[PDB]
Nucleic acid binder design. Structure first.
Ligand SMILES: [Mg+2]
Ligand SMILES: [Mg+2]
Ligand SMILES: [Mg+2]
Ligand SMILES: [Mg+2]
Ligand SMILES: [Mg+2]
Ligand SMILES: [Mg+2]
Ligand SMILES: [Mg+2]
Ligand SMILES: [Mg+2]
Ligand SMILES: [Mg+2]
Ligand SMILES: [Mg+2]
Ligand SMILES: [Mg+2]
Ligand SMILES: [Mg+2]
Ligand SMILES: [Mg+2]
Lengths: 226, 50, 245, 118
RNA sequence: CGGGAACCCAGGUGGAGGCCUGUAGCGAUGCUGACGUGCAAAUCGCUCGUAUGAUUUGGGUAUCGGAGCGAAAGACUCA
RNA sequence: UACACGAGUUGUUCGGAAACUGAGCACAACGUUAUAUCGUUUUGUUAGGAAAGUGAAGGUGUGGGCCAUAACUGAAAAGGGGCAACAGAGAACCUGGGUUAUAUUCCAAAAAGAAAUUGCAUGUGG
RNA sequence: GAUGCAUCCAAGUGGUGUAUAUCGCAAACUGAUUUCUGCCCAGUGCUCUGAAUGUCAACGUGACGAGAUUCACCGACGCGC
RNA sequence: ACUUCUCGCGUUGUUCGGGGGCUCAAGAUUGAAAAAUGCAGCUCUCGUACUGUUUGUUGUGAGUUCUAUUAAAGCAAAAACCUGGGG
RNA sequence: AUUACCAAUCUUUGAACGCAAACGGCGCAUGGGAGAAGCUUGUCAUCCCCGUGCAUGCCAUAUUCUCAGUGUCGA
């Protein structure tokens, strides 16, 4: 019938109880955890905090919808596009090869920056995380310098899948065709309600100082002693 | 005495052979400069230690 | 001149503890989950004699809480502990003479040997033969016990340290006089290499600050400064009270 | 959540593709000859090497030094189509490896030294 | 154990000991012996110290140059 | 014991290694250093991801499974290797005898014999 | 009393006593028993102490000059006592 | 069990004292090896044959025997191997 | 044929790099080639040769060759 083992203290050899939390993880495993907790502890300045108040999933998928359908041509529709720029030009009489990129979003970084400085980017999308964080830290600040609606969005790996690369620091969505002025004209509104309307409280917003659940439930069990 | 490595054995064998006299067909050669062996070791005089 | 015997000793070349006939380091069982939220029984099976120590070392086996083995622990033996005593070393452990129940849970005014300063270092204090500590005070608001070390110097340790109950074995070793240089030879041949002690005043004034002269005299006062450099810090180091009382 | 039932993290057993078995690091030709003529190099004729052909059935070949008692037998059989039972060897005080070779008591040794021309 | 209300008188047993004599071993006191162009760039003879021990010894192994190591002679570290 | 010439050292079992650990050593890693040839290093290494020993489904001759090798996966399993003892550990052979010089080494078939022993095999015993 | 003491190392999460834990370690002195071990803390040493005892180090503070600089001051632990 | 007893040359065992058994390691023994060996004398003449193929006693010793005594000295470690529990 | 010159052969080592090392020692793969007992005249058992590969570090890289992470995110 039954055999009952009490894996109590000292009374029987337990089963293979999952440890996976008190084990010695390899260096990078702990070190990438101690990294995302250390920058929750500290007093995050009001300029770096900006990237931990991203859009919500409500319009983030919509923002990735535009960036996706206005994504560049994938080295195959690029090389056969400029090929019809010779096929129908070699048959053309002369002086007519005129072709350009059909319509896409400015997806580089130094190409995006110029889309802002020119004020030709209608609105820009910015990535939550880039390894040299300073590489895009200033991006949400020359926007309200040039009054472009900006958008700090939750993952650069999700600005890559839409475009086509692996990662993307910031996408700029410049002039669009009248098939889709409806969906973005609201996106600009749905996002500056989160970044430009908030410009005052953003630049005065010290983040972090988020204590543990271990060392701040302790600070709950002592106001329980009050 | 009885333990010598084979490598140390190969090196004393290469010395037992080098300890033979110049053969008497060498000193009738046209212009040699050899009359004696002048590298003959005697086991008592000088030791090899290898 | 040359370096002095004392300075010429932290190189630890020849003057290094021998420990070949020694057993492992004798210390309490590792402070795992079992010795915090309960106890675990352990049988004393063998009481050996680590060469170079007056206290008996008792081989205590416990069960490994997690694997199926029987982990074996080498501990210093409190006096009275015999082979087959079923020692308990945990939280809820009883306080018989040999158990390792935690220090802030032992009753006050009690007698504890093999106490440990830090909570986990597996027993440091009161661990030579016949030595022990008396628990004086618990401070449950601070959570730290003040026990009286076997030197008079009474300190405060945390109330979660562990501690055996009793006196370390081999008490009364230091009272049987040696009567001969040969019984001091065999004492230190299990211990390190410091015997015989040549008096520095019988040395040459190249090998020691005292040596020299036509008479064997310390030329300058033996009491040397606390701050004095090594090779000079010889004699009575920072002696604050000097000579026969 | 992956189940780790260990205090350590031991490296995961990933896929392990085999090597490619590179073609060769040489071109130089080989044969069946050089494998059997390098070992047994020349027989030996002495007062003791003769006394052991007639009295015993052994032979004496000054085999090369880095040979093998199992490969002196193979070499005999490949060179002198005779069987070899006991192949005693010794690296002489000349760096030269001698070899005594019993001929199975069925191949007379005195009928090989006369064939081999010893 | 014998023999007589305390624990002495003796009889053995046993075989301890940095105990004694002494061989080897290890030392080197005396002869200020003999050698001192040696046998010998420190040896020889006799005497002598010790000889269960803090002993002697083999191999391995550690520590070396303004340093090592020393029961300490500034001894020893390939004459 | 010189000189010359010629010879002379034979092993499943003896010694050594393959194959133990000791005092100890120190490759790696890691650290340090202008610099290393430095230091740590089994009473178990390393900020530290340090390994086929096994068990398996599937693949394969063939009347779709009888049966069988094999591939390539991958089952738990903490504590990297590695030296260091011809006196420690370990170690399967004993007599008899016929070299100018070797023999527990050599002896050939009335092995001069007699054993032990390792590897792989066929097969009588269940 | 171990975040110790003594000590090594060119430096290092290095090393030695320490596989140790004051019946221990390190450092001196005298030299078995027995017998005593006197007086002197001025000195020079160790040692604490520092409130006030007297004084100092860059640093920090001030004012000066256009500025290099000047004049200070904090007299601070230490060092005196 | 009224203090008895069993001890060893000896410092101790019982709280076990005899009758049989079970093993244990020394060790003997018969038998194989093994007598054609070997030592060897021989009658005769490497041939040639056969006639003898002997154990008991002592003493000293090396190991076995009993993991006393100096011990603030307690008198190495490991592989391989072995057995068992679970199998 | 000798001499001179200009494709090979090029042992054991050594930076030495499979591991070691006063071991002409020891492996792991991987072929092929001897030798044989069994066995079906040949075929691969351990045994034994020959050859290649196998050191660490680093760089590149792999048609989507495998993976780890309470790093990031999302279905
Ligand atoms: Mg990292
Ligand atoms: Mg001096
Ligand atoms: Mg002085
Ligand atoms: Mg290829
Ligand atoms: Mg004498
Ligand atoms: Mg030797
Ligand atoms: Mg000669
Ligand atoms: Mg190194
Ligand atoms: Mg063992
Ligand atoms: Mg190398
Ligand atoms: Mg490449
Ligand atoms: Mg993958
Ligand atoms: Mg993950």
């Amino acid at each position: 019938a039954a055999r009952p083992k009490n894996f109590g203290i000292g009374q029987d050899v337990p089963y293979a109880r999952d440890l996976s939390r008190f084990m010695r993880w390899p260096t990078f495993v702990t070190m990438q955890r101690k990294k995302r907790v250390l920058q929750r502890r500290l007093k995050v300045p009001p300029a770096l905090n900006q990237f931990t108040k991203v859009l919500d999933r409500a319009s983030r998928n919509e923002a990735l919808k535009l960036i996706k359908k206005y994504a560049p041509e994938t080295r195959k529709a690029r090389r056969e596009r400029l090929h019809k720029a010779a096929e129908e030009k070699k048959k053309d009489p002369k002086k007519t090869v005129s072709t350009r990129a059909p319509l896409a979003v400015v997806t580089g970084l130094q190409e995006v920056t110029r889309a802002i400085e020119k004020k030709q980017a209608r609105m820009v999308v910015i990535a939550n995380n880039v390894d040299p964080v300073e590489l895009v830290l200033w991006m949400p600040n020359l926007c309200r310098a040039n009054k472009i609606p900006y958008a700090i969005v939750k993952d650069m790996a999700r600005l890559g899948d839409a475009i086509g690369r692996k990662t993307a620091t910031c996408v700029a969505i410049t002039d669009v065709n009248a098939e889709d002025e409806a969906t973005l004209k609201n996106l600009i509104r749905s996002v500056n309600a989160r970044f430009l309307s908030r410009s005052d409280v953003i630049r005065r917003q010290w983040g972090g100082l988020q204590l543990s659940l271990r060392s701040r439930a302790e600070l709950r069990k002592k106001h329980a002693r009050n | 005495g009885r333990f010598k490595p084979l490598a140390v054995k190969k090196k004393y064998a290469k010395k037992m052979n080098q300890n033979k006299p110049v053969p008497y067909w060498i000193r009738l050669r046209t212009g040699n400069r050899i009359k004696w062996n002048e590298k003959r070791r005697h086991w008592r005089r000088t030791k090899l230690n290898y | 001149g040359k370096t002095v015997l004392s300075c010429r000793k932290g190189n630890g070349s020849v003057y290094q503890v021998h420990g070949h006939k020694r057993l492992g380091p004798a210390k309490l069982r590792i402070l795992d989950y079992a010795e915090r939220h309960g106890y675990m029984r352990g049988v004393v099976k063998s009481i050996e004699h680590e060469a170079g120590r007056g206290a008996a070392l008792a081989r205590v086996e416990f069960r490994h809480p997690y694997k199926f083995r029987r982990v074996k622990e080498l501990m210093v033996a409190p006096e009275g502990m015999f082979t087959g005593q079923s020692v308990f070393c945990g939280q809820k452990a009883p306080l018989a003479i040999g158990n390792v129940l935690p220090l802030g849970q032992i009753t006050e005014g009690c007698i504890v040997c093999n106490v440990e300063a830090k909570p986990g270092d597996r027993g440091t204090l009161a661990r030579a033969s016949g030595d022990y500590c008396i628990i004086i005070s618990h401070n449950h608001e601070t959570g730290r016990t003040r026990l009286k070390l076997p030197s008079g110097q009474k300190k405060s340790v945390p109330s979660t340290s562990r501690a055996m109950i009793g006196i370390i074995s081999g008490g009364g070793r230091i009272e049987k006089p040696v009567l001969k240089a040969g019984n001091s030879f065999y004492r230190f041949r299990g211990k390190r290499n410091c015997w015989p002690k040549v008096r520095g005043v019988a040395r040459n004034p190249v090998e020691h600050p005292h040596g020299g002269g036509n008479h064997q005299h310390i030329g300058h006062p033996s009491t040397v400064s606390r701050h004095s450099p090594p090779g000079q810090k010889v004699g009575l180091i920072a002696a604050r009270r000097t000579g026969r009382i | 959540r992956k189940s780790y039932t260990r205090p350590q993290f031991r490296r995961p057993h990933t896929y392990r593709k085999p090597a490619m078995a590179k073609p060769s690091n040489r071109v130089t030709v080989e044969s069946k000859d050089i494998a059997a003529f390098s070992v047994i190099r020349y027989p030996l004729t002495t007062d003791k090497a003769m006394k052991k052909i007639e009295e015993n059935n052994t032979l004496t070949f000054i085999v090369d030094s880095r040979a093998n008692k199992t490969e002196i037998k193979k070499a005999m059989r490949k060179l002198y189509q005779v069987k070899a039972v006991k192949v005693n060897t010794l690296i002489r005080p000349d760096g030269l490896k001698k070899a005594y070779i019993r001929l199975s008591a069925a191949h007379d040794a005195l009928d090989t030294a006369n064939k081999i021309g010893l």
